[PDB]
Amino acid sequence: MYHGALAQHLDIAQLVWYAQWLVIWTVVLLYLRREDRREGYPLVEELPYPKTFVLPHGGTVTVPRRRPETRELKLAQTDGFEGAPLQPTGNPLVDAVGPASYAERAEVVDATVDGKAKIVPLRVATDFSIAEGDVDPRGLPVVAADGVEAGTVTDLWVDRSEHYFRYLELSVAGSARTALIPLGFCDVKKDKIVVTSILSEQFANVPRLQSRDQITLREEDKVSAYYAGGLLYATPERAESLL
Amino acid sequence: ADYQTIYTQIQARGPHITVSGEWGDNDRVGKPFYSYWLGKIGDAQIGPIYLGASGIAAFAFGSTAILIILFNMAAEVHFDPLQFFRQFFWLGLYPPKAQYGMGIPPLHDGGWWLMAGLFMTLSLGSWWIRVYSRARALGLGTHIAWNFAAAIFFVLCIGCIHPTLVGSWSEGVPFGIWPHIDWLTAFSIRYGNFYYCPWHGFSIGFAYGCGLLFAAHGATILAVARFGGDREIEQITDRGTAVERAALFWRWTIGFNATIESVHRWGWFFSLMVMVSASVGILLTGTFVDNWYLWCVKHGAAPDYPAYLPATPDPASLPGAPK
Amino acid sequence: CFEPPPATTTQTGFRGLSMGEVLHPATVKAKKERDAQYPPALAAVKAEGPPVSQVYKNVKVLGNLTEAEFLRTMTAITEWVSPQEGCTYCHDENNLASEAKYPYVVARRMLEMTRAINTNWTQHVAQTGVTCYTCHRGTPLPPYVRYLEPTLPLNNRETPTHVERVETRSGYVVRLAKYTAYSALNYDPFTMFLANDKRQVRVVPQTALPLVGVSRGKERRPLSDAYATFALMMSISDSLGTNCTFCHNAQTFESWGKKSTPQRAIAWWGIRMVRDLNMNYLAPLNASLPASRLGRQGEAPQADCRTCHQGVTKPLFGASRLKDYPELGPIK
Amino acid sequence: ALLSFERKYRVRGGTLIGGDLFDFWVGPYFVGFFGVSAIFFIFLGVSLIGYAASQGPTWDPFAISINPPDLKYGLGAAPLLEGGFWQAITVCALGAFISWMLREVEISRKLGIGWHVPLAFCVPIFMFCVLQVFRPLLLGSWGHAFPYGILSHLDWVNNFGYQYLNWHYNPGHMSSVSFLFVNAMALGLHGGLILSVANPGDGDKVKTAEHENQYFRDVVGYSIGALSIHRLGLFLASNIFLTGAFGTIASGPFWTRGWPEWWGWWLDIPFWS
Ligand code: BCL
Ligand code: BCL
Ligand code: BCL
Ligand SMILES: C/C=C1/c2cc3[nH]c4c(c3C)C(=O)[C@H](C(=O)OC)c4c3nc(cc4[nH]c(cc(n2)[C@@H]1C)c(C(C)=O)c4C)[C@@H](C)[C@@H]3CCC(=O)OC/C=C(\C)CCC[C@H](C)CCC[C@H](C)CCCC(C)C
Ligand SMILES: CC(C)=CCC/C(C)=C/CC/C(C)=C/CC/C(C)=C/CC/C(C)=C/CC/C(C)=C/CC/C(C)=C/CC1=C(C)C(=O)c2ccccc2C1=O
Ligand code: HEC
Ligand code: HEC
Ligand code: HEC
Ligand SMILES: CC(C)=CCC/C(C)=C/C=C\C(C)=C\C=C\C(C)=C\C=C/C=C(C)/C=C/C=C(\C)CC/C=C(\C)CCCC(C)C
Ligand SMILES: [Fe+2]
């Protein structure tokens, strides 16, 4: 006699093997794969029933979003093939196509847990400062990809929820304006801030904020996307082959 | 290159935040201090820490188990401080070597082991209350607590459940660096090579799977840190171009993608399945399977290979061979 | 900490199973030189004459040899056992028929034990065989013996440290460790497995499902037996200077046939031979050996794998004196 | 065919070689020069496995095995059915791995993101080379590599570990194992945290990034940070093979005994021996 033996040449560990495969594929295909479809669906050119979040500072959202307005794309198709790439019809940095594209985030200010504006410059966040030993970039020149001084740093924007600097603000030389740049696009040296994503003249068309001492979620998207589009569009050579 | 993905070029300092919980705000202890070099690859603030009854009970129960283990280890070198520091990796507390069944074994042959395991079980249960109650106190889901409970469950499987199902405290895991390592080989030998346990392979695939997922996910968020991809809670409720490019990277590579929320459900599911698979494999082991290799041979799954050196008969089977 | 390349690697299983030996040439070289000290065979002698059962006074084993053939063996034994003490290690210089010295009465039992190995244990020693030298290596005390408790160093010609001494209780774990290839297995596989025939080295079932009546509670062997078998296998692997794949396909340790090498079967006869030597020849010698040879439990020194092999899969890399001394076996 | 937010990203550019020639999509997949070469090596590799498997004794998926040559063939060519098929499939595997990685670089450049994913993909490709090329080269034969089979390659890992008595005492193994455990643990912690904030239960408000750091400062007294846990998780996962590559390449070329004995550098220091 044997423990675990059943009818036929069957045993208990054999049965659990089928049960284990059934549970795994049930979770994968019938749950995880449907949670993967809460954004970007339905396709254009199987879905789960909507999910609704109660936001921390009032109001709700239900995903995926249905925006009351949609943007017009300044793109031209290269061919009639269904999988052909598109082509910009103007300046892709200001038209925001390709790597310069931003999402239609809410035009609301991202908030701290206690309701204040999360991303603010140090002129507003007077209780914040740069840690001892690190470079204070205020007053340092910003050198763009062509080696020309694009401007001078005037302030740093800090995330008051995570204690983490995320942007530098610089006066654009010869443009009577200030533009924000994500610190990921900044190589902070002791005497200069190096920026290779765009050229010096392209700092003039960085998307501008509606208010001087705050920023919205969509404005943060617009500012970040402009420098990223320069990785492919700052010069004609960046869109071509590396070799 | 995004230098922020390597380290924090400019660290920020500010007043330390305290989010109120439903209870226990007064039980947070410690003056926070800030490490410059820790701040380069993480948050610079260390402390404070919450105490609470369950966290205190965890230290008391756990220190009791550790004290029982270390004392028994010091006796194995006859309380020689040099040899203890020398032989430390080799010292251990062992389960009963003789077969007493489920009877509580003597102190010199498994009694101290069973008592340290009891206090360790109480320490783990106390810490799970803390992990569970801290989430409820802050209005958070218990996603970490239930992942934690699966790891505690697997520890119970190799610690007392399987010993009870087969009916012997001798099958339990010893305490010690090398001694608990040696148990892995004796447990695999006894039960016919764990490479032929399907739940071993399931647990291995999920353990490898967590390595693939955190390498791909961690690198993906670093790749979209230029667009604030690390701000994931608000990327869930308000999709930004960070997780749009992230989904399109994987959609253009493997033909499908997840969301910034659901990729966590994949990661939470894979880590959970490492323990769920390992537990079911231990629970079937010995109780309903005695030899996993022959169990595969019974079902025809085992691979066979040609003879390289000539086949060797079992000499114990030969006529006239000694016993 | 590390050993330089290149390494000597053999193949013991089907390609792609990663079975075979992994050796270091510098180690093998030093063992080959050490084992080359085997004194060559003495020259042949006159085959005609009376048997020493007639000529001599107290010959009990070698009585059929002639005088010239008998004094030849008396020279080889001295070369193999006591070359520095000479004839008088075992003989009263003034009467060679007297048993007044303890090595005399032990050597006769050893002459019987040597013929027994070469005659009754050919399933193991084959035509290579053993002489006195295979263990003694030129000294009356063989370098690699075991007592009823772990001892260090393994080679008794080396001076022990304080912690290595069996009296120092704080070094027991290291004495256990070095006899099991530095593992932390808490079992002495000599007294458990090689001193006698009491225990069963095999611990893995030969059934896919747990057989009823031997699978629950006190019907079960403790899992300690699996550690102990593992301990014997690390000691076997170290004493031969080899690894598992010299004998097992690690796919299924418990299976024979294509899953085992021919050496594993020879090893099986080697375990039965060690127990025969310890139980019936070496252990009873504690009544004939002086108290300075005995262990702390009154035991005479006993033999394991390393007594003959000394770190090589074959003793002396297969060197043999069988055809040169037929009086040592096989015995018709 | 396209995601609801996909069309504005479907531009040309970002290629390494080829230009517009292969810069197109096939369904959701992007192609590029390296998507062509990837399909080339996969087709060539899957073909070789099929033809070699037909020559074998079984079509059972668990029983099929394509093995390397005998040790005696060394690093030279081997008969097609005696190890040659293994040699060609290995070349195709590396070609498909490296093409897959460079394809990921092109997709990264078109999307304007960092190259973090293809760089991380170099880690498992590197470990594959340690097992199938580097360690065989140091040992002198390709037959030291593992076979291509669902259940047969486990027997390779098993025998290889026992060839050194107790592979658990391999110090490079202990490090590779420790990272495997801590990475799977950290993924359950981190994946559970994000889901706990976005799904507080009942009809409660979604919590904040402040709630993230407060939970782990309460439990363990420290919270590494939202971005930093992604740098950490990639560091923990990569060091499973980065540290494990040491112990694998040392077993044989640099150490021929059992791995427990290696620890004698500590145990056998004369002043406490
Ligand atoms: C040194 C350590 C060993 C090793 C030790 C082990 C052990 C031990 C185990 C495995 C297990 C597995 N290993 Mg292995 N494995 C190694 C290297 C490899 C390589 C390789 C390119 O070198 C491959 C393809 C695999 C593949 C696999 C799978 C068959 C299986 C589950 C892994 C998993 O979930 O991963 C994470 C990845 C995912 C979750 C994503 C999905 C991946 C799918 C499942 C891959 C299928 C590959 C399949 C064989 C088809 C190959 C291509 C064909 C030509 C179509 N291993 C090395 C050589 N591997 C386990 C098992 O069950 O094996 C049967 C197991 O027990
Ligand atoms: C010779 C040795 C055997 C072997 C023997 C075993 C045995 C036996 C087991 C495994 C198991 C596992 N093996 Mg193994 N395994 C081998 C070869 C492999 C190989 C390989 C490539 O060859 C791989 C990848 C693996 C991988 C795996 C794991 C995925 C799996 C689950 C365990 C785990 O993750 O524990 C890591 C996680 C934990 C231990 C959980 C800990 C959780 C608790 C809460 C932590 C508490 C901390 C607290 C501070 C402690 C305080 C203590 C104080 C005293 C108070 N094995 C070979 C074949 N393996 C298990 C399994 O799946 O069996 C079916 C198992 O039981
Ligand atoms: C008796 C046997 C030994 C043993 C023998 C070995 C050996 C031998 C080795 C390991 C190694 C490893 N062991 Mg083990 N190991 C044992 C016990 C354990 C235990 C345990 C709890 O006891 C654990 C957790 C582990 C765990 C581990 C891993 C962490 C480690 C690295 C695996 C590896 O290289 O994968 C390799 C995986 C790959 C190369 C995958 C590459 C994937 C590529 C890039 C992509 C493939 C795509 C695929 C073909 C696509 C198919 C298409 C589909 C559409 C998907 N071992 C026992 C004690 N272990 C290794 C190590 O580093 O040791 C130091 C090693 O060499
Ligand atoms: C330490 C870091 C790690 C890590 C990380 C990452 N992992 C990544 C990425 C990152 C970052 C990606 O970006 C990339 C990807 O997009 O993911 C979705 C990828 C991927 N990880 C895969 C498998 C995987 N990762 C493993 C290991 C780790 N990953 C560890 C944990 C293991 C283990 C453990 O076995 C497996 C099985 C594929 C799913 C995928 C590549 C597909 C490919 O390259 O397609 C191109 C190739 C093919 C489609 C097949 C080619 C077939 C050849 C010609 C013929 C067969 C040869 C073969 C040797 C036969 C084997 C038999 C078998 C029984 C032995
Ligand atoms: C037809 C033809 C020849 C076309 C030619 C063009 C061409 C090159 C086609 C490719 C054809 C091939 C080879 C297809 C095979 C592709 C492969 C290897 C598929 C394997 C799928 C597997 C098993 C992946 C394992 C990992 C896994 C379980 C993932 C599930 C969860 C997902 C999708 C994680 C990926 C993912 C991560 C990691 C994020 O961080 C993230 C962040 C924000 C949003 C989304 C995501 C996201 O989707
Ligand atoms: C290590 C053991 C050993 C050594 C060395 C040794 N003897 Fe012997 N000797 C014995 C034993 C035992 C016997 C009895 C054997 C027997 O009964 O057949 C014996 C018997 C003899 C006898 C028979 C005498 C008699 O009448 O019984 C002679 C002669 C002899 N040995 C000479 C020698 C010579 C010559 C040497 C060295 C050159 C030597 N011995 C050294 C152990 C030894
Ligand atoms: C030179 C011979 C030899 C070497 C080296 C060797 N083995 Fe053994 N092993 C045997 C033999 C013979 C048996 C069978 C014992 C018996 O029949 O009493 C055995 C038995 C076993 C068993 C138990 C078989 C059963 O049915 O329970 C295991 C497990 C094992 N060996 C593993 C190992 C390990 C682990 C190593 C090294 C680390 C090793 N072997 C090295 C010869 C060897
Ligand atoms: C008293 C003598 C003696 C002892 C004790 C001894 N060996 Fe042997 N062994 C030999 C001799 C002599 C040979 C040479 C046989 C040959 O040449 O094939 C040998 C050969 C072997 C072989 C064959 C190696 C090969 O390459 O063919 C193995 C395996 C082996 N021994 C294992 C063991 C094991 C296992 C033990 C104990 C458990 C042991 N040895 C102890 C005398 C001994
Ligand atoms: C100094 C600091 C900061 C920390 C010190 C840590 C330290 C030095 C510890 C000392 C030695 C070490 C490192 C020991 C390591 C031990 C290891 C790795 C143990 C690993 C596994 C052990 C396990 C899983 C044991 C499990 C045992 C159980 C689950 C027992 C369960 C018991 C029961 C259910 C009791 C109910 C039965 C009742 C009738 C009595
Ligand atoms: Fe995340």
Q: What is the DSSP letter of C328?
A: G
Q: What is the DSSP letter of C92?
A: B
Closest by CA to C6, choosing from C19, C30, C22, is C22
Burial class (CB in 10 A: 0-12, 13-18, 19+), C290: exposed
**Rg of chain C (C-alpha set):** 22
d(CA C175, CA C182): 9
d(CA C171, CA D58): 55
d(CA B142, CA D246): 39
Q: Terminus-to-terminus CA distance in chain C, angstroms?
A: 52
Binding residues of B: 180, 200, 217, 232, 250, 264
d(CA D226, CA B254): 27
Please check whether residues A114 and A89 belong to one and the same domain: no
Do residues C124 and C270 touch, judged by C-beta distance below 8 A? yes
Q: Terminus-to-terminus CA distance in chain D, angstroms?
A: 72
The answer to the question of residue B3 being in a domain is yes
Distance from the A13 Cα atom to the nearest Cα atom in chain C, whole angstroms: 10
Question: Ligand 8 centroid to D246 CA: how many Å?
Answer: 36
Instruction: Find how far residue D112's CA is from the centre of its chain.
Output: 25
- Sole residue written with tokens 């006066």: A171
Do residues C303 and C121 touch, judged by C-beta distance below 8 A? no
Which chain C residues are Cβ-neighbours of B312 within 8 angstroms? Answer: 256-258, 260-262, 264-265
Please check whether residues A95 and A59 belong to one and the same domain: yes
- Sole residue written with tokens 């009791």: B64
Domain C143-205+221-313 has CATH 1.10.468.10: yes
How many degrees, rounded to 5, is the angle at CA D148 between CA D146 and CA D151? 90
> Is C16 at the interface with chain D, CB within 8 A?
yes
What 3-state class would DSSP assign to A60?
Answer: strand
Please list the helix, strand and coil fractions of chain A in percent, rounded to the nearest 5, in that order.
Answer: 25, 25, 50
- Sole residue written with tokens 């006899």: C179
Locate the domains of chain C by residue range: 24-142+314-332, 143-205+221-313
Total structural domains within chain B: 2
Q: Which sign, positive or negative, has the C-alpha torsion B196, B199, B200, B204?
A: positive
Which residue of chain A is at minimal alpha-carbon distance from C208?
A2
d(CA A121, CA A108): 17
What H or E segment, with its residue span, contains residue A63?
A: strand A60-63
- Sole residue written with tokens 């930093």: D228
Please check whether residues A92 and A136 belong to one and the same domain: no
d(CA B295, CA A35): 38
Q: Which sign, positive or negative, has the C-alpha torsion B162, B167, B171, B173?
A: positive
Atom 20 (ligand 1) nearest CA:
D128
Q: Which two tokens stand for residue C101?
A: 């010295």
Please check whether residues A122 and A212 belong to one and the same domain: yes
Report the amino acid identity of residue A82.
Answer: E
Please check whether residues B61 and B11 belong to one and the same domain: yes
The answer to the question of residue B12 being in a domain is yes
Single out the residue in A68, A83, A104 at which a domain terminates.
A104
**Rg of chain D (C-alpha set):** 24
Q: Which two tokens stand for residue A92?
A: 């892709």
Q: What is the DSSP letter of C23?
A: E
Single out the residue in A104, A139, A168 at which a domain terminates.
A104
Please check whether residues A27 and A98 belong to one and the same domain: yes
How many degrees, rounded to 5, is the angle at CA A10 between CA A7 and CA A15? 115
Question: Ligand 7 centroid to C18 CA: how many Å?
Answer: 18
Residues in Cβ contact with A160 at an 8 Å cutoff, skipping those fewer than 6 apart: A112, A116, A117, A118, A119, A120, A125, A128, B14
The answer to the question of residue B323 being in a domain is no
Which 3-state string (H, E, C) describes A130-172? Answer: ECCCCCCCCCCEEECCCCCEEEEEEEEEEECCCCEEEEEEEEE
d(CA B215, CA B201): 21
Residue D192: how many CB atoms within 10 A of its CB?
Answer: 27
Please check whether residues A16 and A92 belong to one and the same domain: yes
- Sole residue written with tokens 């009467």: C95
Single out the residue in A69, A104, A139 at which a domain terminates.
A104
Q: Which two tokens stand for residue A220?
A: 């943060």
Pocket test for ligand 8, best of C117, C118, C120, C125 (most atoms within 8 A of CB): C125
The answer to the question of residue B8 being in a domain is yes
Q: If you write DSSP's letter for every residue of B61-122 in order, what string do you get? A: HHHHHHHHHHHHHHHHTTT-HHHHHHGGGG--B---SS--TTS---GGGTHHHHHHHHHHHH
Distance from the A194 Cα atom to the nearest Cα atom in chain B, whole angstroms: 11
Q: Residue C67 phi/psi, 5° resolution?
A: -60, -45
**Rg of chain A (C-alpha set):** 26
Ligand 9 proximal residues by C-beta, below 6 Å: B 66, 69-70, 114, 117-118, 120-121, 155-156, 158-160, 172-173, 175-177, 180
Total structural domains within chain A: 2
Please check whether residues B101 and B154 belong to one and the same domain: no
The CA-atom distances, in angstroms, between C159 and each of A177, C35, C167 are 87, 21, 15
Bridge-partner residues for A181, per DSSP? A168
The experimental technique used to determine this model is X-ray
Residues in Cβ contact with A210 at an 8 Å cutoff, skipping those fewer than 6 apart: A216, A219
Q: Please indicate whether, in this complex, the C-beta atoms of C16 and D68 are within 8 angstroms of each other.
A: yes
Nearest neighbour of D3 by CB, restricted to B45, B207, B248: B248
Do residues B199 and B281 touch, judged by C-beta distance below 8 A? yes
Please check whether residues B298 and B181 belong to one and the same domain: yes
d(CA C3, CA C97): 55
The answer to the question of residue B36 being in a domain is yes
- Chains with 3+ CB–CB pairs under 8 A to A are B, C, D
Q: Residue B87 phi/psi, 5° resolution?
A: -85, 15
Query: Which stretches does DSSP call E strand in chain B?
Result: 12-13, 28-29, 33-34, 45-46, 49-50
CATH number of the structural domain C24-142+314-332? 1.10.468.10
Closest by CA to C208, choosing from B298, D104, D244, is B298
Atom 3 (ligand 4) nearest CA:
B212
**CB-side exposure of D14: number of CA atoms within 13 Å?**
31
Q: Please indicate whether, in this complex, the C-beta atoms of C169 and B78 are within 8 angstroms of each other.
A: yes
Do residues A20 and B240 touch, judged by C-beta distance below 8 A? no
**CB-side exposure of B69: number of CA atoms within 13 Å?**
24
Closest by CA to A119, choosing from A104, A109, A129, is A109
d(CA B75, CA B79): 5
Q: Please indicate whether, in this complex, the C-beta atoms of B223 and D108 are within 8 angstroms of each other.
A: yes
Please check whether residues B130 and B15 belong to one and the same domain: yes
Determine if residue D173 is labeled as part of a ligand binding site. Answer: yes
Residues in Cβ contact with A158 at an 8 Å cutoff, skipping those fewer than 6 apart: A119, A120, A121, A122, A125, A128, A164, A165, A166, B12, B14
Domains of chain D as residue ranges with CATH: 1-165 (1.20.85.10), 166-273 (1.20.85.10)
Which 3-state string (H, E, C) describes A75-126? Answer: EEECCCCCCCCEEECCCHHHHCCHHHCCCCCCCCECECCCCCECEEECCCCC
Pocket test for ligand 6, best of C55, C71, C73, C91 (most atoms within 8 A of CB): C91
Give the domain extent around A63: 2-104
Which chain A residues are Cβ-neighbours of B45 within 8 angstroms? Answer: 163
Do residues A56 and D207 touch, judged by C-beta distance below 8 A? yes
- Compute the count of residue pairs across chains C and D with CB atoms less than 8 Å apart: 122
Whether the ω angle into residue B48 lies within 30 degrees of 0, i.e. cis, is: yes
Please check whether residues B131 and B211 belong to one and the same domain: no
Give the domain extent around B261: 144-302
What is the tally of helices (H) and strands (E) in chain D? Answer: 10, 2
Atom 56 (ligand 4) nearest CA:
D93
Which chain D residues are Cβ-neighbours of B81 within 8 angstroms? Answer: none
Helix B198-223 with D171-198: angle, nearest 10 deg: 70
Do residues D93 and D38 touch, judged by C-beta distance below 8 A? no
Nearest-ligand number for the alpha carbon of C238: 7
Helix A217-233 with D84-111: angle, nearest 10 deg: 120
Q: Which two tokens stand for residue C308?
A: 């003959």
Residue A219: give its domain's CATH number.
Answer: 3.90.50.10
Please check whether residues B50 and B155 belong to one and the same domain: no
For strands A187-188 and A119-121, give the pairing: unpaired
Report the amino acid identity of residue D54.
Answer: S
How many degrees, rounded to 5, is the angle at CA A50 between CA A45 and CA A56? 120
Q: Please indicate whether, in this complex, the C-beta atoms of A184 and B225 are within 8 angstroms of each other.
A: yes
| Atom number, ligand 8, closest to the C-alpha of residue C117 | 1
Please check whether residues B126 and B175 belong to one and the same domain: no
The answer to the question of residue B246 being in a domain is yes
Helix B198-223 with B241-254: angle, nearest 10 deg: 130
Closest by CA to A155, choosing from A134, A184, A125, is A125
Do residues B92 and B176 touch, judged by C-beta distance below 8 A? yes
Residues in Cβ contact with B172 at an 8 Å cutoff, skipping those fewer than 6 apart: B95, B113, B117, B158, B159, B160, B163
Please list the helix, strand and coil fractions of chain B in percent, rounded to the nearest 5, in that order.
Answer: 60, 5, 35
Distance from the B288 Cα atom to the nearest Cα atom in chain A, whole angstroms: 4
Pocket test for ligand 6, best of C54, C55, C90 (most atoms within 8 A of CB): C90
What H or E segment, with its residue span, contains residue D190?
A: helix D171-198
Residues in Cβ contact with A10 at an 8 Å cutoff, skipping those fewer than 6 apart: none
Please check whether residues A72 and A125 belong to one and the same domain: no
Closest by CA to B268, choosing from B156, B157, B146, B152, is B146
Atom 2 (ligand 1) nearest CA:
D157
For chain C, after which residues does the C atom lie more than 2.5 Å from the next written residue's N, i.e. where is it broken?
none
Please check whether residues B263 and B246 belong to one and the same domain: yes
The reply to whether ligand 6 has any atom less than 6 angstroms from the CB of C65 is: no
Residue B252: give its domain's CATH number.
Answer: 1.20.85.10
Please check whether residues B153 and B58 belong to one and the same domain: no
Bridge-partner residues for A119, per DSSP? A159
**CB-side exposure of B37: number of CA atoms within 13 Å?**
0
CA dihedral D20, D26, D32, D33 (to 10 degrees): -110
Please check whether residues B114 and B174 belong to one and the same domain: no
- Sole residue written with tokens 């018709």: C332
d(CA C197, CA C195): 7
Distance from the D25 Cα atom to the nearest Cα atom in chain A, whole angstroms: 5
Q: What is the DSSP letter of C190?
A: I
d(CA D236, CA D183): 6
Please check whether residues A184 and A232 belong to one and the same domain: yes
